[PDB]
Amino acid sequence: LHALLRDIPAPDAEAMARTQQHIDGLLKPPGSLGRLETLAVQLAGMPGLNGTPQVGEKAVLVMCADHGVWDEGVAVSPKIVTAIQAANMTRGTTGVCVLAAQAGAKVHVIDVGIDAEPIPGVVNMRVARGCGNIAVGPAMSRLQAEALLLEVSRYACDLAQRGVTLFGVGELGMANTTPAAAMVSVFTGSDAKEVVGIGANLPPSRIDNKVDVVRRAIAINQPNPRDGIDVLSKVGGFDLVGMTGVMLGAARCGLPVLLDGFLSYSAALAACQIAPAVRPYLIPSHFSAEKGARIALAHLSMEPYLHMAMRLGEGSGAALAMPIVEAACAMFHNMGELAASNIVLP
Amino acid sequence: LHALLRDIPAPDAEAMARTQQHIDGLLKPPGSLGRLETLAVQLAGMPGLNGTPQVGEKAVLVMCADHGVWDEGVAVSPKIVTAIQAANMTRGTTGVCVLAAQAGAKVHVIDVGIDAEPIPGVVNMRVARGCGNIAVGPAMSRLQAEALLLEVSRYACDLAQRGVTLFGVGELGMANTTPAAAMVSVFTGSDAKEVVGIGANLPPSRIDNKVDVVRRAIAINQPNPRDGIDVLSKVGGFDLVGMTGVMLGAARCGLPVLLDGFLSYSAALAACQIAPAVRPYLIPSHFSAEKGARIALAHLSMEPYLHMAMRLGEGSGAALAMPIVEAACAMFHNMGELAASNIVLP
Ligand SMILES: Cc1cc2nc[nH]c2cc1C
Ligand SMILES: Cc1cc2nc[nH]c2cc1C
Numbered sequence: 086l087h088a089l090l091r092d093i094p095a096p097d098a099e100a101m102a103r104t105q106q107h108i109d110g111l112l113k114p115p116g117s118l119g120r121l122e123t124l125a126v127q128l129a130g131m132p133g134l135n136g137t138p139q140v141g142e143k144a145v146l147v148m149c150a151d152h153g154v155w156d157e158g159v160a161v162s163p164k165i166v167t168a169i170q171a172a173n174m175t176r177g178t179t180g181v182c183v184l185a186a187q188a189g190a191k192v193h194v195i196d197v198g199i200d201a202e203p204i205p206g207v208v209n210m211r212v213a214r215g216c217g218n219i220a221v222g223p224a225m226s227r228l229q230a231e232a233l234l235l236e237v238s239r240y241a242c243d244l245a246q247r248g249v250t251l252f253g254v255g256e257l258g259m260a261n262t263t264p265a266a267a268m269v270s271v272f273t274g275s276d277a278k279e280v281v282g283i284g285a286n287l288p289p290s291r292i293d294n295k296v297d298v299v300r301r302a303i304a305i306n307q308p309n310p311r312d313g314i315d316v317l318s319k320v321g322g323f324d325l326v327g328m329t330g331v332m333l334g335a336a337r338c339g340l341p342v343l344l345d346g347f348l349s350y351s352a353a354l355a356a357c358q359i360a361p362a363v364r365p366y367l368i369p370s371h372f373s374a375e376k377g378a379r380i381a382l383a384h385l386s387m388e389p390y391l392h393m394a395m396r397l398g399e400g401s402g403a404a405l406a407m408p409i410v411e412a413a414c415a416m417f418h419n420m421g422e423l424a425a426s427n428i429v430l431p
Numbered sequence: 432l433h434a435l436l437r438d439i440p441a442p443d444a445e446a447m448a449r450t451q452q453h454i455d456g457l458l459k460p461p462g463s464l465g466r467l468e469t470l471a472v473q474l475a476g477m478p479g480l481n482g483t484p485q486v487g488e489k490a491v492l493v494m495c496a497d498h499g500v501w502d503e504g505v506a507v508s509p510k511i512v513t514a515i516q517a518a519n520m521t522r523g524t525t526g527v528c529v530l531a532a533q534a535g536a537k538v539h540v541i542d543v544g545i546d547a548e549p550i551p552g553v554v555n556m557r558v559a560r561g562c563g564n565i566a567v568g569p570a571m572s573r574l575q576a577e578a579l580l581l582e583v584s585r586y587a588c589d590l591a592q593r594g595v596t597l598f599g600v601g602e603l604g605m606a607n608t609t610p611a612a613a614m615v616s617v618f619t620g621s622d623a624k625e626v627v628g629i630g631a632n633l634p635p636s637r638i639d640n641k642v643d644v645v646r647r648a649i650a651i652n653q654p655n656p657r658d659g660i661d662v663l664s665k666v667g668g669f670d671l672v673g674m675t676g677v678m679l680g681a682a683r684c685g686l687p688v689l690l691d692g693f694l695s696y697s698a699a700l701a702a703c704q705i706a707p708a709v710r711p712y713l714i715p716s717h718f719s720a721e722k723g724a725r726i727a728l729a730h731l732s733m734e735p736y737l738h739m740a741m742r743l744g745e746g747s748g749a750a751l752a753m754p755i756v757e758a759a760c761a762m763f764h765n766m767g768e769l770a771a772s773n774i775v776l777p
């Protein structure tokens with residue numbers, strides 16, 4: 086793990102320079118394709134990409150797990166939904182499944198701690214049957230967190246070896262917006278009220294209780310904002326940990342990772358905190374309809390591409406952005422050049 | 432033409448109701464897929480769609496033309512670029528060509544007034560070799576405008592007959608951001624300064640001259656804001672007219688049209704002014720990096736899906752959004768239902 090972290094590669098400045106130059110000579114006014122150009126340069130800097138914006142196979146990794154904090158009345162979805170929805174992922178009827186199929190990506194469902202019997206078809210990396218209730222203690226032990234990071238990290242890089250070049254990250258876990266908010270509050274220093282959202286349709290009247298629960302989690306655990314693993318293990322969850330581990334794994338493999346929404350933003354804060362070297366490999370997707378979204382993105386210094394008011398999770402946002410990435414590549418590779426058209430601009 | 436306008440169908444409220452109901456029962460928390468749900472309902476209301484969000488063939492219509500206002504020093508791109516780039520459209524090396532191929536759409540290049548010899552391969556609907564210099568008189572005659580609207584309108588609906596169900600609109604014309612701004616100023620009532628942009632990299636120092644030119648166009652022509660055809664013929668251009676005509680044609684055929692950027696917004700203002708019935712068929716794509724973008728979108732009451740800081744035009748933005756439309760359809764049709772999972776939510 087220390088190793089892993091130490092071995093995350095820096096972006097290739099030379100490939101990025103060549104990229105920029107090539108982009109500038111394309112059949113268009115310089116800088117006219119904006120963020121599409123920026124994205125391309127960004128991809129070119131990623132070592133696992135072989136010095137050019139490329140997209141081979143794509144995968145969406147969905148980390149599933151239950152949370153003890155559910156018992157605090159913070160989520161209106163029945164607890165069983167995690168297990169149910171996880172099974173559905175195997176059938177391709179879920180939102181993420183549908184969107185991923187549309188993007189030509191494959192969905193990997195990972196059980197990191199669902200409180201139910203094992204689901205055949207799902208990758209088993211179960212830590213425990215649900216995590217601890219952050220309201221009265223830690224979500225898990227530091228050890229547990231590090232082990233899972235490690236394990237997920239490896240699974241992630243191993244995929245690279247099978248042709249995957251683009252990852253998408255997501256989750257599934259009733260009550261997960263609670264630990265997400267607590268993390269955000271901690272890393273960001275925002276008061277709970279400012280970051281606590283409606284999650285999966287929590288009635289406005291139940292909001293207040295959700296805020297108190299977050300403050301309690303923090304008060305009791307005293308997570309150290311300067312230590313991402315500490316924060317994750319205390320007020321996080323197994324699914325939060327898994328997502329962070331996907332990020333670490335893709336970075337180590339020098340590959341790009343598309344974020345999803347709020348939950349993913351929390352994970353991303355943790356990752357960057359643990360290893361700043363991770364930052365350049367992250368790509369935002371959409372702008373989540375969760376209340377704490379703006380705060381979390383500001384701290385990541387990220388501006389998503391899509392404004393869809395989505396708040397489903399599962400990695401559905403990450404899948405929806407996949408075509409944008411491929412577009413940046415197509416632009417780079419298939420557009421003709423000014424010079425060939427004998428076009429001269431000031 | 433009066434006919435045409437009179438025959439634009441109203442959206443099907445019954446199909447939209449059935450749509451909403453179906454969406455609400457999907458394997459997700461109600462309203463969780465946000466704008467994707469809204470988009471689906473919107474498509475379901477379109478008569479040419481057969482009561483459900485569907486996407487058959489897709490086409491991007493690019494309206495090309497030259498403007499006399501170029502002689503006012505408002506554009507740094509050489510004038511010839513229109514003709515050159517138009518030819519390139521036939522070769523598939525352009526930005527729009529590249530993005531459309533990526534979206535599985537076909538590009539239709541339409542010459543509505545390029546100041547050059549005819550380009551083989553391009554659909555010829557040339558009004559004249561470039562339009563009049565709006566700075567000292569009208570762009571064209573009212574007659575000319577109405578004829579082109581009519582002609583483009585028909586071409587557009589005829590495609591529907593060949594299986595096209597989704598249109599994308601775009602342009603190509605050096606100096607076109609000038610007439611675009613003048614139109615915007617007129618329909619919107621904003622001062623020129625607030626709507627005049629850099630266009631294709633116009634140096635900041637040359638800005639001022641661009642603003643004066645817009646004020647002059649308006650002063651001299653006295654276009655009637657309450658008459659879209661009047662505005663178009665006076666301070667518009669043949670390409671602006673063509674784009675408006677695509678909109679009218681798709682509406683009449685009860686089909687959806689994806690807008691592009693700034694130039695398209697100007698056209699859309701005109702269309703809605705001419706026929707409010709057109710509004711429900713319009714779908715924004717991205718948020719253009721042109722200065723007058725926010726003003727124009729506000730008046731259309733539209734919020735684009737993509738924030739890419741693009742300013743290339745050609746309909747490249749419209750093509751990039753095509754997959755979002757298909758995503759909304761996939762969502763509708765392929766997601767499973769709560770009831771089948773025995774999931775019950777409050
Ligand atoms: C090369 C070129 C391509 C374009 N496409 C639209 N406007 C354009 C302007 C230039 C200069
Ligand atoms: C059905 C359902 C699906 C979900 N996917 C993510 N969170 C969810 C919550 C519910 C209730």
